[PDB]
Write a protein that binds this ligand. Sequence first.
Ligand code: CL
Ligand code: CL
Ligand code: CL
Ligand code: CL
Lengths: 396, 396, 396, 395
Amino acid sequence: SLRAVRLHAKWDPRPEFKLGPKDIEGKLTWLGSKVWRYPEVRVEEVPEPRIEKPTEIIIKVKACGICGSDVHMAQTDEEGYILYPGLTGFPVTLGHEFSGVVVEAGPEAINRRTNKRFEIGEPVCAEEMLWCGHCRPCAEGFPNHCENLNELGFNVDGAFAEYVKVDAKYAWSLRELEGVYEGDRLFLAGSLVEPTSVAYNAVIVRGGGIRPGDNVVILGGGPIGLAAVAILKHAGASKVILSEPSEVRRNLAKELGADHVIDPTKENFVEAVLDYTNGLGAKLFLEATGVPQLVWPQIEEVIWRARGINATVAIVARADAKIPLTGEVFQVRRAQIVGSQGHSGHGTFPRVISLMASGMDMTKIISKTVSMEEIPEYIKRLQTDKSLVKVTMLNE
Amino acid sequence: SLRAVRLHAKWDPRPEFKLGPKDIEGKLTWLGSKVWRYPEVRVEEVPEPRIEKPTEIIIKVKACGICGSDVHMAQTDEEGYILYPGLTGFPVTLGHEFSGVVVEAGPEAINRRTNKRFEIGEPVCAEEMLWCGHCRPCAEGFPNHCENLNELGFNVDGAFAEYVKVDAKYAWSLRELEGVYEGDRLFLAGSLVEPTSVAYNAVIVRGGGIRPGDNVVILGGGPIGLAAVAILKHAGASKVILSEPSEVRRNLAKELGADHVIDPTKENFVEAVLDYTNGLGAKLFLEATGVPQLVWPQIEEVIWRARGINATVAIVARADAKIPLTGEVFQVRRAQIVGSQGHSGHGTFPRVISLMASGMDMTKIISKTVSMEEIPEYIKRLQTDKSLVKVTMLNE
Amino acid sequence: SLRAVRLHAKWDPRPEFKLGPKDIEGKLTWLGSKVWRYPEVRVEEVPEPRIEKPTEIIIKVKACGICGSDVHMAQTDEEGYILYPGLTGFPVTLGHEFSGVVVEAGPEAINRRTNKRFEIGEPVCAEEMLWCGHCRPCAEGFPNHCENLNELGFNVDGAFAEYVKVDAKYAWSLRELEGVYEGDRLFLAGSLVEPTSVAYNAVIVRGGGIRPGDNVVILGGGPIGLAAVAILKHAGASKVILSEPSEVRRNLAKELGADHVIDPTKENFVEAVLDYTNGLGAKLFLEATGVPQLVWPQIEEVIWRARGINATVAIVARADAKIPLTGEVFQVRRAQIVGSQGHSGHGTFPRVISLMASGMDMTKIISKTVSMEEIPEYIKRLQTDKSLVKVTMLNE
Amino acid sequence: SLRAVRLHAKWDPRPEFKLGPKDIEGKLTWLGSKVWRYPEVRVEEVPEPRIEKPTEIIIKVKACGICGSDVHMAQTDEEGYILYPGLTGFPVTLGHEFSGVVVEAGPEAINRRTNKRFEIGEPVCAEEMLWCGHCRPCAEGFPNHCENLNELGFNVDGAFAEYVKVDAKYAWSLRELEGVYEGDRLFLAGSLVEPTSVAYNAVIVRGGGIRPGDNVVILGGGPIGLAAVAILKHAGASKVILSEPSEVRRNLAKELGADHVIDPTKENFVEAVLDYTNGLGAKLFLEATGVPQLVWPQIEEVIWRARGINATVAIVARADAKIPLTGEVFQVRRAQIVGSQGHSGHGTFPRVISLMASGMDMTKIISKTVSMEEIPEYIKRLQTDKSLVKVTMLN
Ligand SMILES: [Cl-]
Ligand SMILES: [Cl-]
Ligand SMILES: [Cl-]
Ligand SMILES: [Cl-]
């Protein structure tokens, strides 16, 4: 009587593949696209989750967003290999951008909000990055770089399901959203915390944030770029400029508070940015396109010509191609480059929840809510349908 | 014949006064209240100001705010000594929270906006702290701690006048406000940059700012406290709480975006702060009351009982009394105390200006605009009339 | 049969005491000195340690330092109450400054050095703050402020024993000391990591550290002050100045790299600090006396009169009395005050270990090594014998 | 009659050169190597310097080091153009790494040591970046990015001379070295403050410094790389590793505190770095080779494979070639890249001076001291003679 969206695939590695040190033959690899072949995504029966450890909770799922990584796990190259390049342990229940209600909690399952055992009925979201808590990075406070990481919806059953079990240490209360987001809207808001927290980690934690009055430039208007728009407007950016080919995304960015939006295929990016900032340029650039080798010369030209100094370029999207870095630009303009990944640690989750509670409405980016049954359809449709910004499962 | 509001007093020191290392007999002291007696303040004739160095500009003053410092220079204790404790060189033209248009400029009088000589007609405000730019603190980037400081409206003629001369290096363009603040409102906003920058230096630079989603508590709802409300809400504070006995001030705080206001004479500050923040407390406390010895226990008790950690207390008001500091509170809650002084350096002035341009309207705090002729009267009135938040000279 | 040094006391609270929210009647309090009476320390037989969770290890103790807190747990006021004011769960095996060798490890007991299960024979030291890993402060990377804290040698059986059981996540490898420190000296050095890490957390992590060339002033030459001398010299402090009335501690400070030592009882602290620093003062002051209310005026006078700015006062010692803080001093000299506690997180332990491995030898401070049997005697003797800087249990 | 080492060159631009917005035809350009041609360096007679501003001082030069910049200003490509690519106003007296004694000071010429007028006899060094103090970068505390810069020994007469004149605000006392550095050595140490401060800015200010116990890796063992070695050893680095093809420089690095040296042409840099750090790698990498495009893939490999995280790569050498940056490496290892230039601001000069006073002896890197007359010869010789690490004029 229980059902979830699951991905099955054939372990059939490419000839260059050698089993990685943390890979498990036939079951788990750190290099998905080298190994897993002919992915199939279907709704299927699953056994009931059960509390195995005293710190575990079982959440009844209300909403779950489809990530671009979900699309890439289910999509193939010409040879039938998945596009998704990273950690994958199939078969798995997909979905990691979620919220729901706690329906069961082991005796040691603590809610950080109360520092007491999780109570039935608590609305929660959870982290996708399942950090171990004991390794050297975790012990220094850097869980996004855990040496023993697992990933919800990648190799641990996720949340395109009726129920999902996770350790309490990954769950965060949505109680603050109550009476700000009525009914289902609370859970929609909750399901956007993970991708907003990716953006938050990138611009606030790794980026170093801004002083109010600073300008920022975001490249890429997907979910992460869009969350950056809202976050940095809320952080007090005087000008928030987003560069993005897609019109629906540029329009969304305006709803989220972008002061200017650029279509880089029809406008000169460099000139628009300099004009918009009166030659000052920006304190922070967020590279969220995934084509940094293509946008990098433009970013450098702004940094070079701008009168502002101390610019940070935060790289959050994944790409393979090399970046054409001109050392001199960063020397002469007192600028720097940081990489970002993940959404865990640093109190990022709770601050994003508080920020949502205090008015920051990300639910605007949800193009469509759908039933669990329609999720396989939309996962496939997102391979080509550029009009869809964010599709969210909603259990009604 | 030009006129300005000038203050005169007698050099007649208290018995404890010994001439300071940088004091000049009869003319200048760093210990104003120990020295200056029976102050008189009036509109009087002044000679034309003039370019005397190639770096100088002359500004036709459009607006100048009365600071509590001006009130304290003209108010005496029961023995006739001025209340203002710091650097004072009388007689002087008063006024240092001001804006106007440039009407003359030396050949080396550079506008930072263009890196070119100031244009006649350029709307500007200026810093009150006249840093030297060559001492060790200045050379390290800390001009609020200049070893050879002079102060506009304290020992150098100021801006309650028709015209004021200042070095171009102190002046900042208000061009960004054009077509956002129309007419006199541009100069009213310009005149609020200095006090707003004192707040900004205290909460962003010294206090270290906040991450969006943090809570903040401001104690004292004078101009500095009110600026801090607006600045920290603009920086994305989830809850901004202001504590101030005065109702007019609390209501203005709401208008500037404070989420909760506390009258500490009628309500329990500690319980209200804890109840408003759901037991989390705040990342930042601004002590802007000047009675730190009275509010310190309440601050400490919040920090102690609050579950939030890493709280910073920023001390911006000048008080003479010992603060009853409990070390253990700061050790156990991982908290710290920073002092703050002034408004110069760190690109505060230009950020405050861009922030106002982007929507942060501080002009809401202006209780009254008056003519130059009325300024002595209002400086007197402000000794007792606590309903007036900010009174501003407006040259029409 | 195994033996250990255990403290027994009577649950007999002062009239003012009310049971704390986390206290357990008859067993555990957060307020030791308000509750525990007539303490007695004895070597007694103990049950064999057991791996009960798969993450635990058992360590054969080689060395354990007597802390001042150990002395204070077994010392009483006139009415028989213990002097130690903090968390205490009696009876308990004392000892928390220790090293030894792994003799057993559970299946999931991971050594951070290798990211593999601990090997039998691995030399280790361990943290005393037993942080939970899951509360909000832990999840934000601040484990010294853990909401569910236990404490080794306070309410969890400690290391004045032949064997001690701890979770693997508190243990740190001493491999790097092999061939630098021969035989027992390796374990002696290991036993000093905890107090050295308290100093390290106080001056590097909380204090913010220094830039090479900065001056530092340390008040108090107990083991914490002595570690700070060593750390801050290794950190590139141009001048390290220690103030301590005990001659033996001043000579130890010189041995650890202090450039100047001050006997405050026979010398003028303020003038001596100002003379030695050529009027510059210091970037960092470490208050490690426990009498911050006696030394504060002198610290404030140096900060005030010094030409340097941006001084930090870090408070590490526990004191009860209020500090007479003059806000103005901190405002005018751009100075700050941070509290510090604990030694966990931030990678402090392993960096302290690497530092020792590269030449920083703290074993110079060990006055005497003694057998387990002699420990109760020395805990008593340390109440009055000030010649003993550090006394360490050595098992052979 | 006074003399100084001066460089004369011809204004004769490359065809692709257009006069820059701040250039002065025949006199000053921001692009030296696009304009100046057939440089000649000679000792010649100069007028006596004169206090022209109340804030100026006049310094009797005691020591001046030759910078790689002086070499590239007097070195040419095959078509006769200077190798130096930046701001140059010729003719000029060369030399900008100097110390000496104040012999005349204007009425407003304040010594930061005293906050009073400089007095005759004060040993000083001075900054080379003549920052304006008033532009927005200067106003914000960032004078290495001054919008109105002048440069001593580039377009303002420098210190390969018996005397040099500078604004008091660029000058820093060497009082603290008295008693520690005996005789001429005080002035040798002073002359090394500017290049040492370049390294300090790069590793402490821009690089963010380190926590004691951290490891560091320096690539390039020129004067900047070698100062970084001493600075970071003094900062408490548990392992200081320097990679450098030159044997003389590797040997100097060990004298300066390096725990390990690597010859990358005869050893595997990646494997050596991981071995010496027991797989943990480094907190900070200083790219001071000027060939970042050749060493970069090796840095990325150490960072990728090391178990340490939060690594910073600080790029201080000037190069032209693009860097093959792999973004994924910095994302997955939580690492970052910072650029650095200059030596001004942030209290770096006075800290470097205090550091030298407390025991950091940079004077070891001086290969040879020469008289003013031999400077032009050594400026030429340094084009080819790689065994000379640092050559210093001693008056
Ligand atoms: Cl992290
Ligand atoms: Cl400052
Ligand atoms: Cl902590
Ligand atoms: Cl700079």
